[PDB]
């Protein structure tokens, strides 16, 4: 319910207040016109009012359509595109394309169709048309939106109205951005408590990762600020409950998921993992309770405080980190490891979704750490009748104790893993675009969470503490903020030239 | 209809191509946002998109409407405007006015109503809102239009398709601006002929005056350029013939005008005269054949080659110049003179419109220069029965031999002149806005209407004068063109 007082603060500035931003922002084509939604929108507006870029604009939009069309409609759409843009006497013929690119796009019917064409289209728009844009009013209007994006949007802008859950350092609240009305989760981390338990590194790591990655399969950070008592992270609201609750607490009589449901989540998790691994992040804490459902029933990975980020030229890390019963053998043996650890945990996760128990312990079995370690290292997992051959086999490939022999991330992707018979009926293209109907959709009228019921001493803050807080409170994330402006109509309202 | 090839060249430039133009541009509020159509238009777009200036914008638009309304419609528009903008809890109450102006506009009457209000409104808009506009995209858009205005637009942009008339130095053509389709008159002056007959001064004076004045009652220059053979003035097309033609050649057996028709043109010519006189220009060649008619029937003065622009702080001048029979006594006596000379010509002109002859010569009576001069100087004019009490007295007041006794230009205006009973039935306000219906609407279907010179070679001084003359495009009329023909609307889109 948009609070008008804060809505009134979303106004475009005079141009003289954008001079500093002009001289300081990364003016990269890819960053500005493809990844930042307002920048893309304004660039397309520029292309739309400049006749000579009409073909490039239209083709670009029509490839995106093709890329997210239903299977049955793709042949027809392929035909329309080739007729509109690739036949030489067509009104919207794209004469800027090399004839080789064109000829190649007029042939074939493969999965890659129109991807080299898109590259070509985007390569072209990154040259002259981009330059022309930078020299247009449309770019100046972008600077106006970036100015507004940089303006203080701290605690007062958010109305907390419910507790979604509890973490180690504070609660997570459902909240509302007052100006726009958009709902988010706000993870609150208590400052004194954080300092006391030396949680800076994990807190900062989660925030840096949630800020830099932009995946539909990982919770997105929109805002990061501090208050007198907390550090706060405002991120994607995930109202559907976590996988653990859904495994055990939704329908207690029949714990676990039917196979198709378990496969769907695995595919979504695999996609989130791939997105991390491509950017050299090892997650190190995949488990059912960290995979959250949204209202549509799509899942995302969360809780990134144990993650590690490999630096340039570093292919392995080391260290005892994670949740017991999800930590790979190579990790437990004190060896170097890479992304492999996450695929082992994916295996335990899949195992648990089908079997409604972990593969190394009986129900309610509470063991010494060393006993659990020896089971992970030495004990072969057994699979009950519930497992189909495909599920058994996939789990066996993931729970492989030797990381060399384990299914996972090879050649910069999970494509190998995607060919496994278990995903026989998944359209990966549609999964990645979010077009699939999830097999389970949470009831809006249900709270899918265990029930909720509501100072540490002798902690004074030195300079190094407040310096860490100010680093952490980096503020507004461009991409999510721009999504918000667009989604909620504010961009529409404010981006006007004449009514 | 437009020629697409030339329409193609009307594109807004990249912003960086406007930075030189931005450095050199010296325009205040009045110049930018009130005088230049496009600037006004973009300034108003700005006010319209910023809620807080809504009241100012609408009160402004509504005062302009009251200023041009028919007489019978004014009281209701006065009441509506007071109720919309001058009452404290009206939605568009104008908070920024001082209560002293609010009170004054809230309870007046007569021709002066809302002019003190408009001044206050415009003064307000010229402060913060104007400063806001300079810091907006709308100002940069204006700079882009000015860039475009300044781009080469010479002979290739103009298709001549018919001869309108013949002058001393060449033909005048009906022509089309190829990009926009707009029709113009293109007066061509042959270069070799100008040099040979020593007409540079007269060419340039005409050009300069038409460029610097902007009145609905004087032909407007949109472009000045040169071809290999000619200097060219592209100006307002006047398709209704000239007044001389209409006096004598239309209904030959009933020559001259019915009095109201004469009064209408006198009123319009006076408006032209006044505009010139307010800008320190003396016409020195007011006569029936120089007053042209447009398609609607409205008239403009034309042919400004014998005119003179007084230098700043100069009040009188000298120079035997003009057409015999229209040159006033003081001019003929060799004395210093001012604008008075033009009111004398207006006397002669009006006289002729009524009598179908000039005041000093019977029909076909051709006399020596000295004899005509002596009549202008000594002869008292006689008035037949075709003149009414009012006509006669007005001509008498205009034809006074002594410029000090003569009706004309006082305290910076013709307001005295306007008060003559001859103008009993004329709304000067509506006339000056172009609102009055003309009493004669010329037919479309009627058109109411050289040799290469030897020994001429051109030197440095000649082609330099030609480049000085060829000053290019005139802002206001160009902006008027772009707005009228829809090019402004088409290129000003942000998202179609
Ligand atoms: N994006 C979210 N949407 C909804 N609930 C969330 C979200 N993130 C966390 N939560 C809830 O709050 C709890 C604590 O958050 P989490 O990030 O897991 O904290 P910690 O790092 O302390 O484990 C979660 O177990 C979950 O119930
Ligand atoms: N703007 C115009 N529209 C239509 N016809 C015109 C226009 N200007 C001039 N003419 C015609 O061309 C003739 C010559 O123009 P003019 O300016 O009088 O040339 P000059 O200065 O050599 O006398 C005019 O008498 C008139 O018939
Ligand atoms: Cl192909
Ligand atoms: Cl292709
Ligand atoms: Cl632009
Ligand atoms: Cl287990
Ligand atoms: Cl007033
Ligand atoms: Cl703006
Ligand atoms: Cl005469
Ligand atoms: Cl004579
Ligand atoms: Mg955590
Ligand atoms: Mg002439
Ligand atoms: Mg002349």
Coordinates of N, CA and C in Angstrom, one line a residue, chain B residues 238-436:
Chain B
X238 N 2.3 35.5 -50.8 CA 1.1 36.4 -50.8 C 0.3 36.2 -52.1
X239 N -0.7 35.3 -52.1 CA -1.3 34.9 -53.4 C -2.6 35.7 -53.8
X240 N -3.0 36.7 -53.0 CA -4.2 37.4 -53.3 C -4.0 38.7 -54.2
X241 N -2.9 38.8 -54.9 CA -2.7 40.0 -55.7 C -2.3 41.1 -54.8
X242 N -2.1 42.3 -55.4 CA -1.8 43.5 -54.6 C -3.0 44.5 -54.7
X243 N -3.0 45.5 -53.7 CA -4.1 46.4 -53.6 C -4.3 47.2 -54.9
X244 N -3.3 47.7 -55.5 CA -3.4 48.4 -56.8 C -4.3 47.6 -57.8
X245 N -3.9 46.4 -58.0 CA -4.6 45.5 -58.9 C -6.1 45.4 -58.5
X246 N -6.4 45.3 -57.2 CA -7.8 45.1 -56.7 C -8.6 46.4 -56.9
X247 N -7.9 47.6 -56.7 CA -8.6 48.8 -56.9 C -9.1 49.0 -58.3
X248 N -8.2 48.7 -59.3 CA -8.5 49.0 -60.7 C -8.9 47.8 -61.6
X249 N -8.2 46.7 -61.4 CA -8.4 45.6 -62.4 C -9.5 44.6 -62.1
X250 N -10.0 44.6 -60.9 CA -11.0 43.5 -60.5 C -12.4 43.8 -61.1
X251 N -13.1 44.7 -60.6 CA -14.4 45.1 -61.2 C -14.2 46.4 -61.8
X252 N -13.6 46.4 -63.0 CA -13.1 47.6 -63.7 C -14.1 48.8 -63.7
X253 N -15.4 48.5 -64.0 CA -16.4 49.6 -64.1 C -16.9 50.2 -62.7
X254 N -16.6 49.4 -61.7 CA -16.7 50.0 -60.3 C -15.4 50.0 -59.5
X255 N -14.4 50.8 -60.0 CA -13.1 50.7 -59.4 C -13.1 51.4 -58.0
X256 N -12.2 51.0 -57.2 CA -12.1 51.5 -55.8 C -12.9 50.5 -54.9
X257 N -12.7 50.7 -53.6 CA -13.3 49.9 -52.6 C -14.5 50.5 -51.9
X258 N -15.4 49.7 -51.5 CA -16.4 50.1 -50.5 C -15.7 50.4 -49.2
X259 N -16.1 51.5 -48.5 CA -15.4 52.1 -47.4 C -14.9 51.1 -46.4
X260 N -15.8 50.2 -45.9 CA -15.3 49.3 -44.8 C -14.1 48.4 -45.3
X261 N -14.1 48.1 -46.6 CA -12.9 47.3 -47.1 C -11.6 48.1 -47.0
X262 N -11.8 49.4 -47.4 CA -10.7 50.4 -47.3 C -10.2 50.5 -45.9
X263 N -11.1 50.6 -44.9 CA -10.8 50.8 -43.5 C -10.1 49.6 -42.9
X264 N -10.5 48.4 -43.4 CA -9.8 47.2 -42.9 C -8.3 47.2 -43.3
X265 N -8.0 47.6 -44.6 CA -6.7 47.5 -45.0 C -5.8 48.7 -44.4
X266 N -6.4 49.8 -44.3 CA -5.8 50.9 -43.6 C -5.4 50.5 -42.2
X267 N -6.3 49.8 -41.5 CA -6.0 49.3 -40.1 C -4.9 48.3 -40.1
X268 N -4.9 47.4 -41.1 CA -3.8 46.4 -41.2 C -2.4 47.1 -41.6
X269 N -2.4 48.0 -42.5 CA -1.2 48.7 -43.0 C -0.7 49.5 -41.8
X270 N -1.5 50.2 -41.1 CA -1.1 51.0 -39.9 C -0.4 50.1 -38.9
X271 N -0.9 48.8 -38.7 CA -0.3 47.9 -37.8 C 1.1 47.6 -38.3
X272 N 1.3 47.3 -39.6 CA 2.6 47.2 -40.1 C 3.5 48.4 -39.9
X273 N 3.0 49.6 -40.3 CA 3.7 50.8 -40.1 C 4.2 50.9 -38.7
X274 N 3.3 50.7 -37.7 CA 3.7 50.8 -36.3 C 4.8 49.8 -35.9
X275 N 4.7 48.6 -36.4 CA 5.7 47.6 -36.0 C 7.1 48.2 -36.5
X276 N 7.2 48.6 -37.8 CA 8.4 49.2 -38.3 C 8.9 50.4 -37.4
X277 N 7.9 51.3 -37.2 CA 8.3 52.5 -36.5 C 8.8 52.3 -35.1
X278 N 8.2 51.3 -34.4 CA 8.7 50.9 -33.1 C 10.1 50.3 -33.1
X279 N 10.5 49.8 -34.3 CA 11.9 49.3 -34.4 C 12.8 50.3 -35.2
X280 N 12.4 51.6 -35.2 CA 13.2 52.6 -35.8 C 13.5 52.5 -37.3
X281 N 12.6 51.9 -38.0 CA 12.6 51.7 -39.4 C 11.6 52.6 -40.1
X282 N 12.0 53.3 -41.1 CA 11.1 54.1 -42.0 C 10.9 53.3 -43.3
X283 N 9.7 53.1 -43.7 CA 9.4 52.3 -44.9 C 9.8 53.1 -46.2
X284 N 9.3 54.3 -46.3 CA 9.6 55.2 -47.4 C 9.0 54.8 -48.8
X285 N 8.2 53.7 -48.8 CA 7.6 53.3 -50.1 C 6.2 52.6 -49.9
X286 N 5.4 53.2 -49.0 CA 4.1 52.7 -48.9 C 3.2 53.1 -50.1
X287 N 2.7 52.2 -50.8 CA 1.8 52.4 -51.9 C 1.0 51.2 -52.2
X288 N -0.2 51.3 -52.8 CA -1.1 50.2 -53.1 C -0.4 48.9 -53.7
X289 N 0.5 49.1 -54.6 CA 1.1 47.9 -55.3 C 2.1 47.2 -54.4
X290 N 2.5 47.8 -53.3 CA 3.4 47.2 -52.4 C 2.7 46.4 -51.2
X291 N 1.4 46.7 -51.1 CA 0.6 46.0 -50.1 C 0.0 44.8 -50.7
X292 N 0.5 43.6 -50.3 CA 0.0 42.3 -50.9 C -1.1 41.7 -50.1
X293 N -1.9 40.9 -50.7 CA -3.0 40.1 -50.1 C -2.6 38.6 -50.1
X294 N -2.9 38.0 -49.0 CA -2.8 36.5 -48.9 C -4.1 35.8 -49.3
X295 N -4.1 34.5 -49.1 CA -5.3 33.6 -49.5 C -6.6 34.0 -48.7
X296 N -6.4 34.4 -47.5 CA -7.6 34.7 -46.6 C -8.1 36.0 -46.9
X297 N -7.3 36.9 -47.4 CA -7.7 38.3 -47.7 C -7.0 39.3 -46.8
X298 N -6.1 38.8 -46.0 CA -5.3 39.7 -45.1 C -4.1 40.3 -45.8
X299 N -3.7 41.5 -45.5 CA -2.7 42.2 -46.2 C -1.4 42.4 -45.5
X300 N -0.3 42.5 -46.2 CA 1.0 42.8 -45.6 C 1.8 43.8 -46.5
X301 N 2.6 44.6 -45.9 CA 3.4 45.5 -46.7 C 4.7 44.7 -47.1
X302 N 5.1 45.0 -48.3 CA 6.2 44.3 -48.9 C 7.1 45.4 -49.6
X303 N 8.2 44.9 -50.2 CA 9.1 45.7 -51.0 C 9.8 46.8 -50.2
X304 N 10.8 46.4 -49.4 CA 11.4 47.2 -48.4 C 12.8 47.8 -48.8
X305 N 13.1 47.8 -50.1 CA 14.4 48.2 -50.6 C 14.7 49.7 -50.5
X306 N 13.7 50.5 -50.3 CA 13.9 52.0 -50.1 C 13.8 52.4 -48.7
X307 N 13.7 51.5 -47.8 CA 13.6 51.8 -46.3 C 14.9 52.2 -45.7
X308 N 14.8 52.6 -44.4 CA 16.0 53.0 -43.7 C 15.9 52.8 -42.2
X309 N 16.9 52.2 -41.6 CA 16.9 51.9 -40.2 C 17.7 52.9 -39.5
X310 N 17.0 53.7 -38.7 CA 17.7 54.8 -37.9 C 18.7 54.1 -37.0
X311 N 19.9 54.7 -36.8 CA 20.9 54.2 -35.9 C 20.4 54.5 -34.5
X312 N 20.7 53.6 -33.5 CA 20.3 53.8 -32.1 C 20.5 55.3 -31.7
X313 N 19.4 55.8 -31.1 CA 19.4 57.2 -30.7 C 19.4 58.3 -31.8
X314 N 19.0 57.9 -33.0 CA 18.8 58.8 -34.1 C 17.3 58.9 -34.3
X315 N 16.8 60.2 -34.4 CA 15.4 60.4 -34.4 C 14.9 60.9 -35.7
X316 N 15.7 61.5 -36.5 CA 15.4 61.9 -37.9 C 16.5 61.6 -38.9
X317 N 16.2 61.6 -40.2 CA 17.1 61.3 -41.2 C 17.0 62.1 -42.5
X318 N 17.8 61.9 -43.5 CA 17.7 62.6 -44.8 C 17.9 61.6 -45.9
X319 N 17.6 62.0 -47.1 CA 17.8 61.2 -48.3 C 16.5 61.2 -49.1
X320 N 16.6 61.8 -50.3 CA 15.6 61.8 -51.3 C 15.4 60.3 -51.7
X321 N 14.3 59.7 -51.4 CA 14.1 58.3 -51.8 C 12.6 58.1 -51.7
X322 N 12.0 57.3 -52.6 CA 10.6 56.9 -52.6 C 10.0 56.9 -54.0
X323 N 8.7 56.8 -54.0 CA 8.0 56.9 -55.3 C 7.3 58.3 -55.4
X324 N 7.5 59.0 -56.5 CA 6.8 60.3 -56.7 C 5.3 60.2 -56.5
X325 N 4.7 61.2 -55.8 CA 3.3 61.2 -55.5 C 3.0 60.6 -54.1
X326 N 4.0 59.9 -53.6 CA 3.9 59.4 -52.2 C 4.9 60.0 -51.3
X327 N 5.9 60.6 -51.8 CA 7.0 61.2 -51.0 C 6.5 62.5 -50.4
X328 N 6.5 62.6 -49.0 CA 5.9 63.7 -48.3 C 6.7 65.0 -48.5
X329 N 6.0 66.1 -48.2 CA 6.6 67.4 -48.4 C 8.0 67.6 -47.8
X330 N 8.1 67.2 -46.5 CA 9.4 67.5 -45.8 C 10.5 66.8 -46.5
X331 N 10.2 65.5 -47.0 CA 11.2 64.8 -47.8 C 11.5 65.6 -49.0
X332 N 10.5 66.0 -49.7 CA 10.7 66.8 -51.0 C 11.4 68.1 -50.8
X333 N 11.2 68.8 -49.7 CA 11.8 70.1 -49.4 C 13.3 69.9 -49.0
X334 N 13.7 68.6 -48.8 CA 15.1 68.3 -48.4 C 15.4 68.5 -46.9
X335 N 14.4 68.6 -46.1 CA 14.4 68.7 -44.7 C 14.6 67.3 -44.1
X336 N 15.1 67.3 -42.8 CA 15.1 66.1 -42.0 C 13.7 65.6 -41.8
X337 N 13.5 64.3 -41.7 CA 12.2 63.7 -41.5 C 12.3 62.4 -40.7
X338 N 11.1 62.0 -40.1 CA 11.0 60.7 -39.4 C 9.9 59.9 -40.0
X339 N 9.2 59.1 -39.2 CA 8.2 58.2 -39.6 C 7.0 58.9 -40.3
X340 N 6.9 60.2 -40.0 CA 5.8 61.0 -40.5 C 5.6 60.8 -42.0
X341 N 6.7 60.7 -42.8 CA 6.6 60.4 -44.2 C 5.8 59.2 -44.6
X342 N 5.8 58.1 -43.8 CA 5.0 56.9 -44.0 C 3.5 57.2 -43.9
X343 N 3.1 58.1 -42.9 CA 1.7 58.3 -42.7 C 1.1 59.2 -43.9
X344 N 2.0 59.9 -44.5 CA 1.6 60.7 -45.7 C 1.3 59.8 -46.8
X345 N 2.2 58.8 -47.1 CA 1.9 57.8 -48.1 C 0.6 57.0 -47.7
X346 N 0.4 56.7 -46.5 CA -0.8 56.0 -46.1 C -2.1 56.9 -46.5
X347 N -1.9 58.2 -46.3 CA -3.0 59.1 -46.7 C -3.2 59.0 -48.2
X348 N -2.1 59.0 -49.0 CA -2.3 58.9 -50.5 C -2.9 57.5 -50.8
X349 N -2.4 56.5 -50.1 CA -2.8 55.1 -50.3 C -4.3 54.9 -50.1
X350 N -4.8 55.4 -48.9 CA -6.2 55.3 -48.5 C -7.0 56.1 -49.5
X351 N -6.6 57.3 -49.8 CA -7.3 58.2 -50.7 C -7.6 57.4 -52.0
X352 N -6.6 56.7 -52.5 CA -6.7 56.0 -53.8 C -7.6 54.8 -53.7
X353 N -7.6 54.1 -52.6 CA -8.5 53.0 -52.3 C -10.0 53.4 -52.5
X354 N -10.3 54.6 -52.0 CA -11.6 55.1 -52.0 C -12.0 55.8 -53.4
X355 N -11.1 56.6 -53.9 CA -11.4 57.4 -55.1 C -11.1 56.8 -56.4
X356 N -10.3 55.7 -56.4 CA -9.8 55.0 -57.6 C -9.0 56.0 -58.5
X357 N -8.3 57.0 -57.8 CA -7.3 57.8 -58.3 C -6.5 58.5 -57.2
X358 N -5.3 58.9 -57.5 CA -4.4 59.6 -56.5 C -4.9 61.0 -56.3
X359 N -4.5 61.6 -55.1 CA -5.0 62.9 -54.8 C -4.5 64.1 -55.6
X360 N -3.4 63.8 -56.3 CA -2.7 64.9 -57.0 C -2.8 64.9 -58.5
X361 N -3.4 63.8 -59.1 CA -3.5 63.6 -60.5 C -4.8 63.0 -61.0
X362 N -5.4 63.6 -62.0 CA -6.5 63.0 -62.7 C -6.1 61.8 -63.4
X363 N -7.0 60.9 -63.8 CA -6.7 59.7 -64.4 C -5.9 59.9 -65.7
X364 N -4.8 59.2 -65.9 CA -3.9 59.2 -67.1 C -3.2 60.6 -67.2
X365 N -3.2 61.4 -66.1 CA -2.6 62.7 -66.1 C -1.1 62.4 -65.7
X366 N -0.2 62.5 -66.7 CA 1.2 62.3 -66.4 C 1.9 63.7 -66.5
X367 N 2.6 64.0 -65.4 CA 3.2 65.3 -65.3 C 4.7 65.3 -65.1
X368 N 5.4 66.4 -65.2 CA 6.8 66.6 -64.9 C 7.0 66.3 -63.4
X369 N 8.2 65.8 -63.1 CA 8.6 65.7 -61.7 C 8.3 67.0 -60.9
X370 N 8.8 68.1 -61.4 CA 8.7 69.4 -60.7 C 7.3 69.8 -60.5
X371 N 6.4 69.4 -61.4 CA 4.9 69.8 -61.3 C 4.3 68.9 -60.2
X372 N 4.6 67.6 -60.2 CA 4.0 66.7 -59.2 C 4.5 67.1 -57.8
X373 N 5.8 67.4 -57.7 CA 6.5 67.9 -56.5 C 5.8 69.1 -56.0
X374 N 5.5 70.1 -56.9 CA 4.9 71.3 -56.5 C 3.4 71.1 -56.1
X375 N 2.8 70.1 -56.5 CA 1.4 69.8 -56.2 C 1.4 69.2 -54.8
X376 N 2.2 68.2 -54.6 CA 2.4 67.6 -53.3 C 2.7 68.7 -52.2
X377 N 3.5 69.7 -52.6 CA 3.9 70.7 -51.7 C 2.8 71.8 -51.5
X378 N 2.1 72.2 -52.5 CA 1.2 73.4 -52.5 C -0.3 73.0 -52.5
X379 N -0.6 72.0 -53.3 CA -2.0 71.7 -53.7 C -2.8 71.2 -52.5
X380 N -4.0 71.8 -52.2 CA -4.9 71.2 -51.3 C -5.7 70.1 -52.0
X381 N -5.9 69.0 -51.3 CA -6.6 67.9 -51.8 C -8.1 68.1 -51.8
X382 N -8.8 67.7 -52.8 CA -10.3 67.8 -52.8 C -10.9 66.4 -52.7
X383 N -12.1 66.3 -52.1 CA -12.7 65.0 -51.8 C -14.1 64.9 -52.4
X384 N -14.3 63.9 -53.4 CA -15.6 63.7 -53.9 C -16.6 63.1 -52.9
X385 N -17.9 62.9 -53.4 CA -18.9 62.3 -52.6 C -18.7 60.9 -52.1
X386 N -17.8 60.1 -52.7 CA -17.5 58.8 -52.3 C -16.8 58.7 -50.9
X387 N -16.2 59.8 -50.5 CA -15.7 59.9 -49.1 C -16.8 60.3 -48.1
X388 N -16.8 59.6 -47.0 CA -17.7 60.0 -45.9 C -17.0 61.0 -45.0
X389 N -17.8 61.7 -44.2 CA -17.2 62.6 -43.1 C -15.9 62.0 -42.5
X390 N -15.9 60.7 -42.1 CA -14.8 60.1 -41.4 C -13.6 59.8 -42.3
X391 N -13.9 59.4 -43.5 CA -12.8 59.1 -44.5 C -12.0 60.4 -44.8
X392 N -12.8 61.5 -45.2 CA -12.2 62.8 -45.5 C -11.3 63.3 -44.4
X393 N -11.8 63.2 -43.1 CA -11.1 63.8 -42.0 C -9.8 63.0 -41.7
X394 N -9.9 61.7 -41.9 CA -8.7 60.9 -41.7 C -7.6 61.2 -42.7
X395 N -8.0 61.2 -44.0 CA -7.1 61.5 -45.1 C -6.5 62.9 -44.9
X396 N -7.4 63.9 -44.5 CA -6.9 65.3 -44.2 C -5.9 65.3 -43.1
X397 N -6.1 64.4 -42.1 CA -5.2 64.4 -41.0 C -3.8 63.7 -41.4
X398 N -3.9 62.8 -42.3 CA -2.7 62.1 -42.8 C -2.0 62.9 -43.9
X399 N -2.7 63.8 -44.7 CA -2.1 64.5 -45.8 C -1.7 65.9 -45.5
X400 N -1.6 66.3 -44.2 CA -1.1 67.6 -43.8 C 0.3 67.8 -44.3
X401 N 0.5 68.9 -44.9 CA 1.8 69.3 -45.5 C 2.9 69.4 -44.4
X402 N 2.5 69.8 -43.2 CA 3.4 70.0 -42.1 C 3.5 68.7 -41.3
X403 N 4.6 68.0 -41.1 CA 4.6 66.8 -40.4 C 4.2 67.0 -38.9
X404 N 4.4 68.2 -38.3 CA 4.1 68.4 -36.9 C 2.5 68.4 -36.7
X405 N 1.8 68.8 -37.8 CA 0.3 68.8 -37.7 C -0.3 67.5 -38.1
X406 N 0.5 66.5 -38.4 CA 0.0 65.3 -39.1 C -0.2 64.1 -38.1
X407 N -1.3 63.4 -38.3 CA -1.5 62.2 -37.6 C -0.4 61.2 -37.9
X408 N 0.1 60.5 -36.9 CA 1.1 59.5 -37.1 C 1.5 58.7 -35.8
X409 N 2.8 58.8 -35.5 CA 3.4 58.0 -34.5 C 3.8 58.9 -33.3
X410 N 3.2 58.6 -32.1 CA 3.4 59.4 -30.9 C 3.7 58.5 -29.7
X411 N 4.6 59.0 -28.8 CA 4.9 58.2 -27.6 C 5.1 56.7 -27.8
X412 N 5.8 56.4 -28.9 CA 6.1 55.0 -29.2 C 5.0 54.1 -29.8
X413 N 3.9 54.8 -30.3 CA 2.8 54.0 -30.8 C 1.9 54.8 -31.7
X414 N 0.9 54.1 -32.3 CA -0.1 54.7 -33.1 C -1.5 54.7 -32.4
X415 N -1.4 54.7 -31.0 CA -2.6 54.6 -30.2 C -3.5 55.8 -30.5
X416 N -2.9 57.0 -30.6 CA -3.7 58.1 -31.0 C -4.4 57.9 -32.3
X417 N -3.7 57.5 -33.3 CA -4.3 57.2 -34.6 C -5.5 56.2 -34.6
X418 N -5.3 55.2 -33.8 CA -6.4 54.2 -33.6 C -7.7 54.7 -33.1
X419 N -7.6 55.8 -32.3 CA -8.8 56.5 -31.7 C -9.6 57.3 -32.7
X420 N -9.2 57.4 -34.0 CA -10.0 58.2 -35.0 C -11.3 57.5 -35.2
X421 N -12.4 58.4 -35.3 CA -13.7 57.8 -35.6 C -13.7 56.9 -36.9
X422 N -12.8 57.0 -37.8 CA -12.8 56.1 -39.0 C -12.8 54.7 -38.5
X423 N -12.1 54.4 -37.4 CA -12.0 53.1 -36.8 C -13.1 52.8 -35.7
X424 N -14.3 53.4 -35.9 CA -15.5 53.2 -35.1 C -15.7 51.7 -34.9
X425 N -15.7 50.9 -36.0 CA -16.2 49.6 -36.0 C -15.1 48.5 -36.1
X426 N -14.0 48.8 -35.6 CA -12.8 47.9 -35.7 C -12.3 47.5 -34.3
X427 N -12.3 46.2 -34.1 CA -11.6 45.7 -32.8 C -10.1 45.6 -33.1
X428 N -9.4 46.6 -32.7 CA -7.9 46.6 -32.9 C -7.2 45.3 -32.3
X429 N -7.8 44.9 -31.2 CA -7.2 43.7 -30.5 C -7.3 42.4 -31.4
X430 N -8.5 42.2 -31.9 CA -8.8 41.0 -32.8 C -8.0 41.2 -34.1
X431 N -8.1 42.4 -34.7 CA -7.4 42.7 -35.9 C -5.9 42.3 -35.8
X432 N -5.3 42.8 -34.7 CA -3.9 42.6 -34.4 C -3.5 41.1 -34.1
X433 N -4.5 40.3 -33.8 CA -4.3 38.9 -33.6 C -4.6 38.1 -34.8
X434 N -5.1 38.7 -35.9 CA -5.5 38.0 -37.1 C -6.8 37.3 -37.0
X435 N -7.7 37.7 -36.1 CA -9.0 37.0 -35.8 C -10.1 37.5 -36.7
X436 N -10.1 38.8 -37.1 CA -11.2 39.4 -37.9 C -11.3 38.7 -39.2

